[PDB]
Amino acid sequence: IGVPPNSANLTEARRRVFDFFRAACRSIPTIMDIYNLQDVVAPSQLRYAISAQIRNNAHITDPKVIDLLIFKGMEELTDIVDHAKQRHHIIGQYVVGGKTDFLKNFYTSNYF
Amino acid sequence: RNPVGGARVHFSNPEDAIEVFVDGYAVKVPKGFTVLQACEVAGVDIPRFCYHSRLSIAGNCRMCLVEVEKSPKPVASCAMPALPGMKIKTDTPI
Amino acid sequence: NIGATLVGVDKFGNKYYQKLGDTQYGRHRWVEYASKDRYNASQVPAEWHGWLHFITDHTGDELLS
Amino acid sequence: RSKKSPMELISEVPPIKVDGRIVACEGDTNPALGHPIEFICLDLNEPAICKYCGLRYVQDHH
Amino acid sequence: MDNQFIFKYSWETLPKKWVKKMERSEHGNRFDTNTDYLFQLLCFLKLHTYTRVQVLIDICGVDYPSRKRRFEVVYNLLSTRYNSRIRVQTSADEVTRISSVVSLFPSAGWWEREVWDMFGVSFINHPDLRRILTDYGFEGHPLRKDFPLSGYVQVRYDDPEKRVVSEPIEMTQEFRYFDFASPWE
Amino acid sequence: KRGEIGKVSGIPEEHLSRKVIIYSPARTATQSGSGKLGKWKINFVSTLKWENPLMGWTSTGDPYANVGD
Amino acid sequence: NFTLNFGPQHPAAHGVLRLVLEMNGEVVERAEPHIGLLHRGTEKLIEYKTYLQALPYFDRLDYVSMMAQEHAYSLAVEKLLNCEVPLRAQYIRVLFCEITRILNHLLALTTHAMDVGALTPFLWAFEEREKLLEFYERVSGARMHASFIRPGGVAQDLPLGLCRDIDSFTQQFASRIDELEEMLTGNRIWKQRLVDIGTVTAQQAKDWGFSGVMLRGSGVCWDLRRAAPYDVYDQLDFDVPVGTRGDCYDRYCIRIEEMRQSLRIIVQCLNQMPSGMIKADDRKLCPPSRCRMKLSMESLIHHFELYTEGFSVPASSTYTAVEAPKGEFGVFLVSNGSNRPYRCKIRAPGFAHSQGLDFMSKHHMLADVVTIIGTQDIVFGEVDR
Amino acid sequence: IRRYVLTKDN
Amino acid sequence: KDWNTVFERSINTLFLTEMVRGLSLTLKYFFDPKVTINYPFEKGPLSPRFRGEHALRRYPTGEERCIACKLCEAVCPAQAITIEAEEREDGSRRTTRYDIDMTKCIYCGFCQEACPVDAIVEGPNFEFATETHEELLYDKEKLLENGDRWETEIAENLRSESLYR
Amino acid sequence: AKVKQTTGIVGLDVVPNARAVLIDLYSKTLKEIQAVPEDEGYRKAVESFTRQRLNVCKEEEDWEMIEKRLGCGQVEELIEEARDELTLIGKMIEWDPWGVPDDYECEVIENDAPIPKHVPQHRPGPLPEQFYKTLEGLIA
Ligand SMILES: CCCCCCCCCCCC(=O)SCCNC(=O)CCNC(=O)[C@H](O)C(C)(C)COP(=O)(O)O
Ligand code: SF4
Ligand code: SF4
Ligand code: FES
Ligand SMILES: [Zn+2]
């Protein structure tokens, strides 16, 4: 329902992170039916995708920033649950994925 | 307040520094500064057409005219030297 | 085109008619195009365009001079 | 005569004879329908060109 | 009834710890309060007999990137009984949640959603705080000063993909910014 | 750099690694007024522009083409 | 209960309407309007334009009532500038605002009647709509988006025959309203499709931010032209109609009466309009005459500066609201002292009205939702900027 | 502008 | 209430007497003159202030009035004008490129009222729908052709509002 | 003398007895404002206007006379104000905002920039006398 009050410590932020992760995990079966993802992706590759996003945003130590990140993730999850976003959008974002980098960039363009 | 354009006033000595009232505000300027420069120190930017800070003073355009209490006629602030205790007036009807 | 007065003729052959109105107007300034091959929907010169759209009261023969 | 550019068209208008040393060019017979008023000094030998119209004015006698 | 009367009455009646800035002028009588006293102030101004403010006209945000508390939230209020208008303002940055007033004024929901969509300010105890105006999946808050005018992404139809797709923006003619500011201002 | 606001803002990660210049623009040489001074600006160094090969217009693909100005 | 979708893409009902209805049986339990299909970023585009350049944006906000938004923007700019407007310009602005109110009321009433199923009054009303758009096309150069009302005075003067033609129009608009009223008011089907539909109490209208006909249908006598008068509205005589039951029928009756009173105000403005100049004499804020710019140096300098930089509004912020045909149209203008607005929020009456569709339609038939939508006179140009 | 600042004033 | 009133209002309920009153109005409007116009042949009334297709005017001597002041480009709220200028061979200030985006134009007339030499005007033409997008990217040649084609009507209109502008 | 047929406002219904409901609400308001500290601006204003309205409701029996003397809306718009004031008093009691901070400071900006006459300005008529009497009570 209502937006939760702002957290006061990192423990509450971690608890909200875990709650949101569990909510996203329970939301996995619904997406597999709303979008024809049955013969597309394993039911654990998506789980790993959310885990990887949480882990690469895991260097934050500000509880307010963590709460805002959780809120944005929950908004994205609610949007994906509804038919608002197109099918290829989630498949375009939620899929897990030789001389020198400098020389290839040099061959490409002057603006690195 | 700060000088117009962030201008830096170099005081050679603290002894030689007169005091003027640009708009009722106490302003400390070195001896030798003009009324226009004293106004520039006090954040007031006087109109000018013929005055350039890198060129010699020549009060032709008469655009920088201000009011001075001990003056019957407006003075060209670009050429008038600043005197201690002088009260300048810029936004007055004159 | 019945009970109407021909105002003038255009260089393309278009004929311009006028009828007098009293209180509600209607069919008082129109053109009989000299062509019938779909008439291109835009063949009125600048001197007659103003008269047709009631912009100016000059016919267009007078607008030339 | 679409082959003539406006430069060539304005280069064919003969200069206007003016008796005085100065002429005011407005650009049209009706002042409100022309360009801003332009005062041209005719103290040279070559015709003096209006910077709006391109019209050239030359002094008549001296 | 008037700016001269409302100012004095609210100076006397209101608790002092709520309001920290009071302007009385012809442009509008404003009140500036901390974000933790906003709800209390509006509840007081909605129920008091001599300050019966029962209409919330709108809620808007203002972006000031040079301030520490970046965003300014403005509550324009109207009192039909006394024919007077009151403006109440608070200040919040990008990572603080201010109290919602949907409990007092039911119409506040859509303006609060619009403020969150346009500036990124979150409201505590809002029944549903989701974007209302921007496109689905929109990233970024457009009404911020640091948000580019044309945005970051562009929309076009992809024939091989057989759907309307989103691509990074690439203008055929960039926005020409004209600097008309005068040095004699 | 604690770019947490950049992460919770919505700017794409590609544009969050830009190099900017913070500077105060100086007075123009063609005017003696000093009104447009004292303000500080962020220069994103957005120089990647080209010419439209249909009308000669200036095309760009940089969102921060004129934000700082 | 199941979930329903009305997206009418055809402009037989708005055009960008998107309702997600939760219906138990034939009743609707909640109406969730999805807006944002016409959000064009108008508010952000204002900050990148000069005060003069941002004026045409307000024509396209409530595109059935064009002069109402320009009047509000001009009044806000004058308030932030302390610019005095000549009396003739004020009379012209009031006259055209009332013409705009009549146009909006006609379009609203007959587009609402067409949704119910009455096809005839639509074309009968659009005839008079064409007649009034002729008057707009005469003074300005545009039939609809006329940038006529401007912050200083008004853009330009009236042609010769405009007053005579407007008087001729007013000689018959009363009979036009009478015929339109005869088609709908006494009809039993029209009564049965509006009576007791969309009832709102005064407390609900105040809480949800209702204004204009929506608010005055509940018994609240609140008119911004009488509570906070602007221009010469305090020198004109007109009544304020007030409803008794708050249903859709009272809204329709009040919408008829408001248009009759607008006719009355138009007649008074025509009779009492004085002579004089149409703009403020401070040429630092208004353009010079085309004959003066081509003859005087200072007039040319003013023309150049106005049409490149424009005027600079001193640093301040204010909220000005006018009585738009839909309701209270407000502009929250913030100025930082430059030639471009720092912030300009547009308070659209349709926003607060479409927000309240959820509670007006609850426990109503599906066929009554179209009437509830049409009685609010919602256009989405203003709902989502 | 008369931007005077109030105080508890004991 | 009265038996007479009950009888009177019960008859009107059953005899549909408030629908015959609408049928009579519709029928009376059936036998009436129509107000529709034959668009290809007769056009609707306009005004000399009408803002239609843009046109670049020239002096009666054959010189274009545009002096490349870019004052119309700076006032355009839609940024629909792009102007490139340089010193001509004679030394006159003239445009090399003057193109207007008719897909960005909002037809507000700000450019017409900002031109100090009356070079850019909006003519009475409103029938210029094209079959291709880049035919709506008017350039200097197209605008000059419009000015030459509509010169007499544009001149008459500008003469008309000489008393107002 | 007769009962009010209609209030003219949708949702607001005529109360058959308004001198018996207003008197009780005002008595409750006076008995419940006691918990607020004596030297607070809210208590003085609330205990002033409530006292006058209670008295006025006491002297005169008919509702028409009560409407005339108070001159501020109908009695059905006064019952709702009394109930809202009771609710506000309760919320003040539970919030307890009466504590003046030691570091309190307020910037009272006084701008005097004039605005034009044609600009929309909210101009009400003079308020009833108690709206001022409470004001001098607060100042004193
Ligand atoms: C299809 C589904 C749609 C929605 C999918 C989700 C989309 C958004 C994903 C969320 C994006 C975010 O950044 S939301 C989550 C961001 N919040 C954090 O990262 C908190 C900081 N991390 C830590 O404290 C620890 O590393 C911790 C990781 C907790 C564990 O380690 P320990 O306990 O040992 O301490
Ligand atoms: S009419 Fe308006 S939008 Fe079109 S080119 Fe002229 S100024 Fe620009
Ligand atoms: S058309 Fe007029 S305003 Fe535009 S550049 Fe040419 S002379 Fe200047
Ligand atoms: S600047 Fe010209 S007189 Fe001083
Ligand atoms: Zn000339």
Cβ separation E12–J88 shorter than 8 A: no
Secondary structure of chain G in the HEC alphabet? CEEEEECCCCCCCCCCCCEEEEECCCEEEEEEECCCCCCCCHHHHHCCCCCCCCHHHHHCCCCCCHHHHHHHHHHHHHHHHCCCCCHHHHHHHHHHHHHHHHHHHHHHHHHHHHHHCCCHHHHHHHHHHHHHHHHHHHHCCCCCCCCCECCCCECCCCCCCHHHHHHHHHHHHHHHHHHHHHHHCCCHHHHHCCCCCCCCCHHHHHHCCCCCHHHHCCCCCCCHHHHCCCCCHHHCCCCCCCCCCCCHHHHHHHHHHHHHHHHHHHHHHHHHCCCCCCCCCCCCCCCCCHHHHCCCHHHHHHHHHHHHCCCCCCCEEEEEEEECCCCEEEEEEEECCCCCCCEEEEECHHHHHHHCHHHHCCCEEHHHHHHHHHHCCCCHHHHCC
DSSP letter, residue E16? T
Residue of E118, E4, C35 whose CA lies nearest to J110? E4
| Extents of the domains making up chain A | 1-112
> Structure tokens of E83?
């024919």
Interchain CB distance below 8 Å, D37 and G295:
yes
Question: Residue D12: what residue type?
Answer: E
- Residue J45: which of E2, E23, E50 has the nearest Cβ? E50
Asked if J92 lies within 8 A of E47 by C-beta distance, the reply is no
Residue nearest to atom 1 of ligand 2 (CA): I107
| Cβ I120 under 6 angstroms from ligand 2 | no
Are β-strands E71-79 and E84-92 bridged in parallel, bridged antiparallel, or unpaired?
Answer: antiparallel
E65 with E5: CB under 8 angstroms?
Answer: no
Of C4, C7, C1, C3, which is closest to residue C58 (Cα–Cα)?
Answer: C7
Cα end-to-end span (Å), chain G: 34
CB pair distance less than 8 Å for I82 and F54: no
> What resolution does the deposited structure have, in angstroms?
3.4
For E44, counting Cβ atoms within 10 Å of its Cβ (0-12 exposed, 13-18 middle, 19+ buried), the class is buried
- Tell me which method was used to determine the 3D structure: cryo-EM
- CA E72 from centroid of its chain's CA atoms: 7
Q: At J73, phi and psi to the nearest 5?
A: 75, 180
E: neighbours with 3+ CB pairs under 8 Å? A, F, G, I, J
Question: Is there an interface between G and I (3+ Cβ pairs < 8 A)?
Answer: yes
Which residue has the least CA distance to atom 7 on ligand 3?
I66
Give the pairing type, strands D16-18 and F21-23.
unpaired
Q: Which ligand is nearest to the CA of A23?
A: 1
Chain CA centroid to CA D13, Å: 9
Closest ligand 2 atom to residue I72 Cα is: 7
A84 to chain E: closest CA residue: E136
Count of other CB atoms within 10 angstroms of residue F2: 10
Reported as half-sphere exposure (CB side, CA atoms, 13 A), residue E34 has a value of 10
CB contact under 8 A, I137 and F56: no
- Residues B30 and B11: their CA atoms lie apart, in Å, by 6
Shortest CB distance from A78 goes to which of E122, E123, E130?
Answer: E130
Q: What is the 3-state secondary structure (H, E, C) of J62-120?
A: CHHHHHHHHCCCCHHHHHHHHHHHHHHHHHHHHHCCCCCCCCCCCEEEECCCCCCCCCC
CA distance G307 to I70: 10
Tell me if I46 CB under 6 Å of ligand 2.
Answer: no
- If you take atom 4 of ligand 2, which residue's CA is the nearest one? I105
**Is A57 at the interface with chain F, CB within 8 A?**
yes
CA distance E11 to E5: 10
* Chain E environment of F28 (Cβ under 8 Å): 183
State if residue B59 touches ligand 4 by the CB under 6 angstroms criterion: yes
Instruction: Please indicate whether, in this complex, the C-beta atoms of B5 and F37 are within 8 angstroms of each other.
Output: yes
Q: Is I2 exposed, middle or buried (0-12, 13-18, 19+ CB in 10 A)?
A: exposed
Q: Where do runs of H (alpha helix) occur along A27-100? A: 28-34, 45-56, 63-81, 87-93
Cα distance from N-terminal residue to C-terminal residue, chain C: 28
Do E and C make contact, counting contact as 3+ CB pairs within 8 angstroms? no
Tell me, in angstroms, the distance from the centre of ligand 3 to residue I64's CA: 10
- Decide if J119 contacts E81 (C-beta within 8 A): no
Q: How many CB pairs under 8 A join C and I?
A: 62
Report how far ligand 2's centroid is from the alpha carbon of D36 (Å): 23
> How many whole angstroms from its chain centre is CA C19?
11
Q: Give the whole-angstrom CA distance, residue G380 versus residue G9.
A: 13
Smallest Cα–Cα separation from I154: which of I71, I43, I62, I54?
I54
CB atoms within 10 A of CB B27: 23
I111 annotated ligand binder: yes
Question: Least CB-CB distance to I117: which of D7, D49, D52?
Answer: D52
Distance CA A104, CA J79 (A): 80
Chain E residues lying within 8 Å of F57, measured CB to CB: 172-173
Domains and CATH numbers, chain G: 2-383 (1.10.645.10)
| J122 in G contact zone (CB under 8 Å) | yes
Instruction: Name the residue among D30, D32, D53 with its Cβ closest to that of I63.
Output: D53
Q: Determine the Cα–Cα distance for residues E134 and E139; give it in Å rounded to an integer.
A: 9
Chains that touch C (3 or more CB pairs under 8 A): I
Closest residue of chain F to B4, computed from CA coordinates: F34
Query: Considering CB atoms only, which of E170, E175, E183 is closest to F33?
Result: E183
Tell which J residues from 83 to 112 touch H, by Cβ distance under 8 Å.
100-111
Q: Which residues, other chains included, contact G159 with Cβ-Cβ below 8 Å and sequence gap of 6+?
A: G138, G139, I47, I164
Confirm if E155 and E165 have CB atoms less than 8 A apart. yes
| CB-based contact E172 F27, cutoff 8 Å | no
Chain E residue with minimum CA distance to I78: E175
- Do the beta carbons of residue J29 and residue J50 sit within 8 Å? yes
d(CA E30, CA G318): 10
Burial class (CB in 10 A: 0-12, 13-18, 19+), E103: middle
What does the block give as tokens for J1?
């003398």
Q: How far is CA E154 from the centre of its chain?
A: 27
**Nearest ligand to residue I52 Cα:** 2
- Residue I159 is labelled as binding a ligand: no
Is B48 in Cβ contact with F32 (below 8 Å)?
yes
How many degrees, rounded to 5, is the angle at CA G8 between CA G4 and CA G10?
Answer: 165
Hey, which of A7, A16, A20, A54 would you mutate to test ligand 1's pocket, going by the most ligand atoms within 8 Å of its Cβ? Answer: A54
Collapsing DSSP states into helix, strand and coil, what is residue F24?
Answer: coil
Ligand nearest to the CA of residue I118, numbered in listed order: 3
The answer, for C15 touching chain I at a CB cutoff of 8 Å, is no
The reply to whether residue I49 touches residue G140, judged by beta carbons under 8 angstroms, is yes
Q: Does I89 touch chain D (CB under 8 A)?
A: yes
**What span, in angstroms and rounded, lies between the C-alpha atoms of G25 and G122?**
32
Atom of ligand 3 nearest to the CA of I111: 3
Contact: G294, I45; criterion CB under 8 Å: no
In degrees and rounded to multiples of 5, residue E122 shows phi and psi of -95, 145
**Would you give the DSSP letter of residue D33?**
G
Residue closest by Cα to atom 4 of ligand 3: I72
What is the number of other CB atoms lying within 10 angstroms of the CB of residue E20?
Answer: 16
Using CA atoms of G199, G203, G208, G214 in order, give the dihedral in degrees to the nearest 10.
50
Hey, which chains touch J, using 3+ CB pairs under 8 Å?
Answer: E, G, H
Neighbours of chain I (3+ CB pairs under 8 A): C, D, E, F, G
Tokens of D5: 């550019």
Residue to mutate among D25, D29, D30, D37, with most G CBs inside 10 A, is D37
| Torsion angles phi and psi, residue G237, rounded to 5 | -100, 120
Q: Which of B39, B45, B50 should be mutated for ligand 4, with most atoms under 8 A from CB?
A: B50
* CA A66 to ligand 1 centroid distance, Å: 8
For residue G362, the Cα-to-chain-centroid distance in whole angstroms is 28
Instruction: Check pocket membership of A49 for ligand 1, CB cut-off 6 A.
Output: no
Alpha helices in chain F (DSSP H): 4-7
